[PDB]
Symmetry: D2
Subunit: 727 residues, 4 copies
C-alpha cells in the first residue's frame, strides 16, 4: 500500500549503532558485510521480500489477503478458498516441541581462531593453524524453564558452541559452571524432573525454589557442589558476555603419533566476570523477561562483540590418579591452582541471526559430535549423554534428516549410504546405496586414520572389569569441593550464597526437607550452616556443630579463580548508564557525561517522566529514550543525574525510586550540582560516601570517578547500608 | 579399493539403449543432457559420490565401516560408538507413511507445450503461447494397493501431472477413466474402505474381488458406471503409455474479459490405447509385479518417450443445462459425439528421476493447486477434494513446509508471511511477518487480478439456496451411462466385461451379494445380465427380464471413442518381441528379423533355455537376454522363432509352454522354416491361421505380416480357439 | 435397515468351519469362547457396533451420512460442515510408516505352557511351572517386501513371539533359518539396502534377484550360509505352520544361584516341515498374493491351530 | 493432530466423550479402540448397516444444520456494514 513513512525512518542504518538507537533487525540486513564461510553458504536459503508480489506457497499471486471467499459478503465461507486454507494450515503447524532441557536460549554467529598450532598434542584440524578461521554458531541458555520463560532466573546456564571445521562439525556443549549436579546419566531424568515444574500443577517456572528439587538434593549429596555454584551469584549472571564457560567432562586430545592427553575445556569471558544480585535478578524477570536475549543482540549490533578465550586444562595420561578426586567424576572440578588453564584461541560473536526460528530454535548440538584429534573418556555422565541428543533431536525437528536444516549442515557436504527418511532434501545419484559395492567402484570410500584428513579411530583405551551396574567407589566423596568453593568466595559472596539457600529453602513447604538440607550444609561448612539455619529459625544440634569438616582438596585452603570477584577483571566497554534528565538540563554537564561514556565504549540512555523531547539550557533538543518506569534501574549498570532544573523531577516518585532501587542494588550513582538534593532520598551523609560520586559539576574528574566505580561493577562496601532503606 | 571390473562394465552407457541392453540408472547419469528449467534448478540438491570420502552426516570421515566399536574384538558394543548409532538411527527412520490411496505409483519428468495460444478462452499463462515450455512431473499409479503391491492388477489408474508454470504450480490430478465411482466426497472414506483390504485380516491386496466392494456397489448404484470401466479391459492397461487420462470434473477456464467456459480435461496417448487380457494381467502380477514401473523407466531410457496430447471438451456457460445429465455430476461422462475434444498441446516424458524416494515418493499433488485462468465448479466430489490432500501431505511428508522439498517447489521462489513449521529451510529476512505493515513498506504485496501476472480472483458465480445436506435430484440417474459404455464396446470387449464381473463375483463369498449385483446389471443391459448370471449359475427372474433399459444418452446408442479398440490406433514403436533361439540359429533370419523390427522401432529380447550365448549357423555369436522361464511371454507383445536346429528346443517344455501362453493371450506368433513344427503344440491347421505368421524363411514379407499384426495389438479372432488350449 | 438378507446368511457361524465355508471374521466374533489373560484384558478397548447410532468422534449423532453441507443442492460445499471435515480428516491420516524390514506379516494370538519346571537352569518365571500358561502374540513375516507385497516370495521369514509373562514381556524375535546373513549389526543397513529395491527406480519388490544383492553377497562371503538356506526350498514355505523358527543368537539362561548357561532357541512345527517349489511359489504371488496370511487365518478358524514346540 | 500426534486425539482420556462413539473411521497413529464391526463402510449389508444414521428430532436426533438462505456471488469481500 506504501505504508512506510516518507522519510526512511522505519528502517535502521546498516552500521553499528548503540542499544535503543534504532529498530533492531535481522543480522544480514543490519551488518551485510559481516561474513564468514558458513554465513556465506547460508545465502542460498535466505529469502528477500522487498518488491516481490505476495504469493501462495506454490507461487500463485494473491489479490486479496484481507478476506475469505464466501457466498455473499455476509455469507458462509466456502470450502474452495484454497488461499485461506493454506494460510491457516501453515499457521496451525508453526510450533515444534521445545528442547526437553535448555528450551530458553539466545544465539549468534561468529568465528574462532587458534593462537598457535596445537599439532604436538592434537591432530584436530581446527587447532592446527592460527591463520585459519573456523566459523562458529553459539547458543547460550537457561536449563529448567520453557522457551517462553525469563532470562534472569537463578539457574545454571548452558553454553554450546558449534565449530564448522574442515574435518567435520565439532560441538562443544558445556555450561557456565565447571561441574554438573549428578554423576551418572542414568539419573538425568530423576534430577531434571525434580528441578522442573511439579507434575500435578506445572509450577514453578524457571525456579529450583520448590520441594522436589530440595528433596532430591537432600537425598543425593553428589549434587551439593553444583548447588553451591547455583546458589551463589554465579546463578544469576549480568549477561552471557560476562560468565565463564566449561566443557565439564574430561575429554581426550589425540595427536598424529597416537599419544592421548586428558583435557578439560574452558571459555574465559574477555569482558570479565559479573553477576546481578538476587532481588535485582528476580525483579528483572518481571520488568524485562528478555533481558539476556536483548543485551546479547544489542551488544552485537553496537559492535561490542562477545569475546571469549578457549583454554585447556591438560593432564598427562600418567597423572590420571594423582588427585584427591576422580578425574572422570563430573561433580568434581580441577582447581586451576593445581592444573592451570592454557590459552588456546579466541572466539568472537559478530553477527546475529536473521530468523530466530530458522537458526536458533532449529539448531542442534551434540557432545558426541567430535572430530579426529578428540576423543571421549569413561566419565559416566558424558557416556550416557552420548545416547541422548540425536534421539531427542529427531523427535523435536521432525526427522533423521535434521542435519540438512541449513544451520546444522557441515561446510563441506557429506557423502555416505544413508537414504530416505522424512524430508530428504539431497537427491542421491550414486548407483550404490550400500557398501561394499562394485557398481560405483566402492565410492564413497573409507579413509584410514592419519595425521591430517584421516578417518576417525577411537583411542584404544584398555577396558577391564565385569559387566556391572556400579558406581566407582572413587566417586563417593561429596563435601570437599563444595567446601573449597565456599572458602574461595569473598565475604559478600558468602553472604549472597547464604541468602540464596535461605530464600530457596523458605519456598520449600515441607519443613523436614529444609532441615535435611541444613544437615547437609553442616557437612560442608559450619559457618555456612549456622547462617542458613538462623534464617530458617533452626538451631543446629550439638552433633551437627561437631561434624568434622571435609578434607582440603589436594591441600588447598582456597582457589581464587573460583570467585567471580576476588581478583578484579572488570571491563566497562558495553555497559550502559541511565541519565535522569530534567526539563532544563545544563548541557555542559550532559556534553561532558556523554563524551566520557562514549570514549570508553559505555552506552547511555536518556530518561524522563514522559516521552518526546526536552530542551537543554542552550536550546539543545534532547530526545528521550524511555521513561523512569519504562526503563528501570535494573536494566542499567549505573545512574547519573545531571544538574538542571532539578525541581522538575525532585518530587517525582519514579525519579526518586529509581535512585533508591539502584542504591539498593549496589550500583554506582553520580550526582551533579543541584542533583545532590537526591542525597536525602538515599540517606547519604553531607560528607558523602564511597560509591556516590558528587560534585558541583560533571567535569572530567567526576566522570573518571564514576567510570572507576563502573570498573569494579558494584559497590560491595554499601551492603550494610542497604539493609535499612525500604526499596 | 577397486571392486569394479577392469573392463568398466558396471557403468551403463550415457546414450539411449534398448530394454535390457544395459543396467538401468538414475536419469541424470543416464541422460545428463536431457534438461528443462525444473530439472536444472534441482541441480543444487543432486549429490555425487564418486571420488568422495565416506563421512558421517556431520562430515567426519569414517575409517572402518565394517565394525561396531567394542571392548575387545569378542566383547560388548560400546555406547560411545556414535558412527554406528548415527548409521542405525537413520536406517531406523527411513520409512514414511504411504499415500492413503494411490500408494503404488511410477513417475517421470518431462515438458508440455501448447499448439496455439488459448488467450481467447483462458488467461492461464502456460497456455498463452506455443513457445511457452512448461516443465512437468507426472505420477501414474494404481488406487487400491499398498506401495509394495503389483502393477498389473485390475484397478482404476491415477494420472497426476504437476505443471511448473511461471505463475505457479497447477496440478492436474486425474485418472484413466472419465468418471468416478461416487458423487459426493462425503462417501470417499466409505467407498475406499469397501475396496481396500478388509479390516479384520487385511486381505485382499490390490483387488476389488472381495465381498465388501461388491456389497457397497450393490447398495450404491451411482458406482455402476466406473465399475463398468474397471471390469472392462480399461482396468488392465498394457502400460501407462497406452492409456487415456481424464480430469473427470468439469472445471472453468476464465479469460481476461472475465468470461467463464466450462471444461473437461483429456490426455490422449500418442502411443495409442492398449490393454492386457485378464489372465495375462493376473499372471504378470506374479512373474513381474513391477512390470509397468519397469516398462515406463525403460521406454524412457530407450528414447521411447511417453507422449500425450492435452485435450479440452469446451462447454459454453449457456449450455450448462443442455444435456440430459448434470455437468457437475462426476459419475457422468460427456460423449465426444456431443462435445468433441479440442487438441490443445502435447506433453512428453523424457527423463526418469535420480532417486525414487526423494522425487517420486515425496511428490505432492493437489487438485486445489490452480492458477489464474482456471477455476473450480460446484461438482460435489471435486469440492470435497479441496478438504484433503494438503492435510494428508503434512502427516506423510512431516510438516507444513513440504512445499520446500525440491520436487514440490515452484520454479520461482514464493513470497508470503507464513513462518516456521518443522523443517523450515528458507531463512526469511523480512522485517515484517504480517501485513499490512509499514516497516517493510507492505511487501511482499497484493496484486490485482488482470490479464497476465495478476492475483487470483474467483469467478463470481451466483450462489442461491438453503444450507442443506442434500443430493441434487438431477444426479439421481445411474444406468444410462453404463449402458452407453456397454453398447460402444466391441463384441470381444463386451465378452471381456462379462468375464470380469463373472470372475469377480465368483470370489464374493456371500451369494446374496452376487445376486444383488446381477440384479443391477439387469437394469443396465439384459444381455450382459444373463451372461454374468449364467456364469454364476443364476437364473434371471421374470421381472428382471422385463426391466426396460434406461434411456439413450442424448440420442446416442454407442460412442466409438469409449471403446479401446473399435477404431484402430495402435503404435508398434516401443513394443517388444521375444525371439526364441536354438543352438544352430539360421543367421539369415535373425538379421532380417532384426533389420525389420528396428526399422519400426520394435525391441527384441533373445531368449534361450540357459544363459550365456549361442553360436549362429555362420558363427555369429548371440548373447542371451534371458531364459524361457525367466522372461515369460507375458512380458512381450509377440513371439518369433527363427529357423535353425529346432530339435534343440522342440521337446523343451518351457519353449512349448511359451508359445501356448502367447497363443492363449491372443499375441502374434511368427514361425520360420522348421519353426512351423511348433504349430502342433498350439494345434494350428496345415493351411494356417490368421494371426500365425508362417513362411519358408524370415524374409521381408514375413516380417511385414508380423509387424502389421503387432500394429493391431492382439488377434481378437483367436478368442473362440483358445478355449481348447490347456495353458 | 433391512440391508442384511432375511435368511441371515450375511453372518458367519460362530463355530469352527473349514476354509471357504463361511466369510472370515474378527476372532472375537468367530470364536467368542476362546480366551486367555491378554485376550481378556483387551476387552476394555474392544468396541461393538450393532444397535448403535452413527456418531462423530465427539459423540454427536449423524443424520445424513450421504451428503456434504452446501448452499443449494447443487451449490458449493460449506466450510462449516464439521461432520464432513472430521470424516475426511481421519481418513487422510489413516496410514503409518510400515516397518523398515519385515513390513509384510501375519499374526495371531495363542498360549504357551512349559512341559516341566526349568528352575534348575533358569529363574525365568514363564518356565517355572507346567500348570502356568503364558498368553502370546505371534507375527510371521517376510523381510524385503512392503506391507502390500506378496506372501509366497523367495525370502527369509521372520518369526516373532510376544510372551506376556507375570514378570514382564519377553519377545523372542526370530527367523525361520538358524543363521543370519551378516556378523556385525554395523552392516545391517548396507545389507538391507542391497536386498531391497534399488534406489533409482524402486524395483524390484520382494525379490533378491537383482544386481545389488548378488554384488553385496559376492563381496561379503559371510553372507553365503544364509544365502544357501534362502536359495533352497527353505526360502519358500508352504505355510507359516510348516517352517522351523530360531532365535539365531546364543543367549544366556540364568538360574537362582547365578549360574549361566549358553542357549540357542528353537521352534519345532508340530505340523512338520513343508515348502513349495519355485515356479509354484512365484505364480502364487500372482494368483493369491495373500496366500500365507489367508492360510494362517483359515487354519485357526477351522480349528487346525498352528502348534510349535 | 500435529500437536497431539495423530487423528486419534479424541481417544486421549481427557478428550473422550462420556458415551462411546461409533462410526466407520479406522486406523491412524496410536489407535486405542479395537473395532470388531465386520463392516468399515456404509451402507453395508454385512453388519445390517450398523452403526446407523438417526433422523433429527426433538431429543436424541441426528445433527441437522439450520436451513439458512444463502444468496450472493462468490466473493472475497468485507461486508460494508462491518466498516
Ligand atoms: C555435563 C553435563 C551436561 C551438560 C554440560 C549439558 C549441556 C547441555 C546444553 C548446553 C544443552 C542445550 C544446547 C542448545 O542450546 O541447543 C543441552 C541440551 C540437552 N541435553 Fe545436555 N547437558 C549435560 C547433561 C545431559 C545428560 C546427562 C543428558 C541425558 C542423557 C542430556 C540430555 C540433553 C538433551 C536431550 C538436550 C536437548 C537437545 C536438543 O533438543 O537438541 N544432557 N545440554
Ligand atoms: C474424481 C475423483 C478423484 C480423482 C480423479 C482422484 C485422483 C487422485 C490421484 C491421481 C491421486 C494420487 C497422486 C499422486 O500420484 O501422488 C490421489 C491421491 C489422493 N486423493 Fe484423490 N482423487 C479423487 C477423489 C478424491 C476424494 C473425493 C478424496 C477425499 C475427499 C481424495 C483424497 C485423496 C488423498 C487423501 C490422496 C493422497 C494424497 C497424498 O498423500 O499426496 N481423492 N487422488
Ligand atoms: C539375527 C538377526 C535378526 C533377526 C532374527 C531379526 C528379526 C526381525 C523380525 C522377525 C522383525 C519383525 C518383527 C515383527 O513381526 O514386527 C524385525 C524387525 C526389525 N528389525 Fe530385526 N532382525 C535381525 C537383525 C536386525 C538388526 C541387526 C537390526 C538393526 C541393527 C534390525 C532392525 C530391525 C528393525 C529396525 C525392525 C523393524 C521393527 C519395528 O518397526 O517394529 N534387525 N527383525
Amino acid at each position: 500500500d506504501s505504508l512506510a513513512p516518507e522519510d526512511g525512518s522505519h528502517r535502521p542504518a546498516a552500521e553499528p549503532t548503540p542499544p535503543g538507537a534504532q529498530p533492531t533487525a535481522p543480522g544480514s540486513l543490519k551488518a551485510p558485510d559481516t561474513r564468514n564461510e558458513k554465513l556465506n553458504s547460508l545465502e542460498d536459503v535466505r529469502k528477500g521480500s522487498e518488491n516481490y508480489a505476495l504469493t501462495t506457497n506454490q507461487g500463485v499471486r494473491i489479490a486479496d489477503d484481507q478476506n475469505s471467499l464466501r457466498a455473499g459478503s455476509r455469507g458462509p465461507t466456502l470450502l474452495e478458498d484454497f488461499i485461506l486454507r493454506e494460510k491457516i494450515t501453515h499457521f496451525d503447524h508453526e510450533r515444534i516441541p521445545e528442547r526437553i532441557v535448555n528450551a530458553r536460549g539466545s544465539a549468534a554467529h561468529g568465528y574462532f581462531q587458534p593462537y598457535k598450532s596445537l599439532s604436538d598434542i592434537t591432530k584436530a584440524d581446527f587447532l592446527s593453524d592460527p591463520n585459519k578461521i573456523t566459523p562458529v554458531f553459539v547458543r547460550f541458555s537457561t536449563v529448567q524453564g520453557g522457551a517462553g520463560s525469563a532470562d534472569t532466573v537463578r539457574d545454571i546456564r548452558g553454553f554450546a558452541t558449534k565449530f564448522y571445521t574442515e574435518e567435520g562439525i565439532f560441538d562443544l556443549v558445556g555450561n557456565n559452571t565447571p561441574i554438573f549436579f549428578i554423576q551418572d546419566a542414568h539419573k538425568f531424568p530423576d534430577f531434571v524432573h525434580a528441578v522442573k515444574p511439579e507434575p500435578h500443577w506445572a509450577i514453578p517456572q524457571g525456579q529450583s525454589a520448590h520441594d522436589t528439587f530440595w528433596d532430591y538434593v537432600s537425598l543425593q549429596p553428589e549434587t551439593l557442589h553444583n548447588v553451591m555454584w547455583a546458589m551463589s551469584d554465579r546463578g544469576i549472571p549480568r549477561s552471557y558476555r560476562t560468565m565463564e564457560g566449561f566443557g565439564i567432562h574430561t575429554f581426550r586430545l589425540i595427536n598424529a603419533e597416537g599419544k592421548a592427553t586428558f583435557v578439560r575445556f574452558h571459555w574465559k569471558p574477555l569482558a570479565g566476570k559479573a553477576s546481578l544480585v538476587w532481588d535485582e535478578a528476580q525483579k528483572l524477570t518481571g520488568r524485562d523477561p528478555d533481558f539476556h536475549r536483548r543485551e546479547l543482540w544489542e551488544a552485537i549490533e553496537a559492535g561490542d562483540f562477545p569475546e571469549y578465550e578457549l583454554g585447556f586444562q591438560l593432564i598427562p595420561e600418567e597423572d590420571e590418579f594423582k588427585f584427591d578426586f576422580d578425574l572422570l567424576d563430573p561433580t568434581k572440578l580441577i582447581p586451576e591452582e593445581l592444573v592451570p588453564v592454557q590459552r588456546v584461541g579466541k572466539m568472537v560473536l559478530n553477527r546475529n541471526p536473521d530468523n530466530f526460528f530458522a537458526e536458533n530454535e532449529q539448531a542442534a548440538f551434540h557432545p558426541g559430535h567430535i572430530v579426529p584429534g578428540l576423543d571421549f573418556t569413561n566419565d559416566p555422565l558424558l557416556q550416557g549423554r552420548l545416547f541422548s541428543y540425536t534421539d531427542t533431536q529427531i523427535s523435536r525437528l521432525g526427522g533423521p534428516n535434521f542435519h540438512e536444516i541449513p544451520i546444522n549442515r557441515p561446510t563441506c557436504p557429506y557423502h555416505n549410504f544413508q537414504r530416505d527418511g522424512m524430508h530428504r532434501m539431497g537427491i542421491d545419484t550414486n548407483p550404490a546405496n550400500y557398501e561394499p559395492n562394485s557398481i560405483n567402484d566402492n565410492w564413497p570410500r573409507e579413509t584410514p586414520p592419519g595425521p591430517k584428513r584421516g578417518g576417525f579411530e577411537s583411542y584404544q583405551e584398555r577396558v577391564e572389569g565385569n559387566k556391572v551396574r556400579e558406581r566407582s567407589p572413587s566417586f563417593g566423596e561429596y563435601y570437599s569441593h563444595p567446601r573449597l568453593f565456599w572458602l574461595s568466595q569473598t565475604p559478600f559472596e558468602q553472604r549472597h550464597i547464604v541468602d540464596g539457600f535461605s530464600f530457596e529453602l523458605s519456598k520449600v513447604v515441607r519443613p523436614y526437607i529444609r532441615e535435611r538440607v541444613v544437615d547437609q550444609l553442616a557437612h560442608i561448612d559450619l559457618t555456612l550452616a549456622q547462617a542458613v539455619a538462623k534464617n530458617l529459625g533452626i538451631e543446629l544440634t550439638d552433633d551437627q556443630l561437631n561434624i568434622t569438616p571435609p578434607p582440603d582438596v589436594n591441600g588447598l585452603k582456597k582457589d581464587p579463580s573460583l570467585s567471580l570477584y576476588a581478583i578484579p577483571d572488570g571491563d566497562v566497554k558495553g555497559r550502559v548508564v541511565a541519565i535522569l534528565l530534567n526539563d532544563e538540563v545544563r548541557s555542559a554537564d550532559l556534553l561532558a557525561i556523554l563524551k566520557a561514556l562514549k570514549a570508553k565504549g559505555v552506552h547511555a540512555k536518556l530518561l524522563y517522566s514522559r516521552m518526546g523531547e526536552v530542551t537543554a539550557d542552550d536550546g539543545t533538543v534532547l530526545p528521550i529514550a524511555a521513561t523512569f518506569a519504562g526503563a528501570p534501574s535494573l536494566t542499567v549498570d549505573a545512574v547519573i543525574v545531571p544538574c538542571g532544573n532539578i525541581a522538575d523531577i525532585a518530587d517525582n516518585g519514579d525519579a526518586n525510586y529509581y535512585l533508591m532501587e539502584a542504591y539498593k542494588h549496589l550500583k554506582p550513582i553520580a550526582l551533579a550540582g543541584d542533583a545532590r538534593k537526591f542525597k536525602a532520598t538515599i540517606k547519604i551523609a553531607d560528607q558523602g560516601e564511597e560509591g556516590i560520586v558528587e560534585a558541583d559539576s560533571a567535569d572530567g574528574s567526576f566522570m573518571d570517578e564514576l567510570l572507576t566505580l563502573m570498573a569494579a561493577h558494584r559497590v560491595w562496601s554499601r551492603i550494610p547500608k542497604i539493609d535499612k532503606i525500604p526499596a
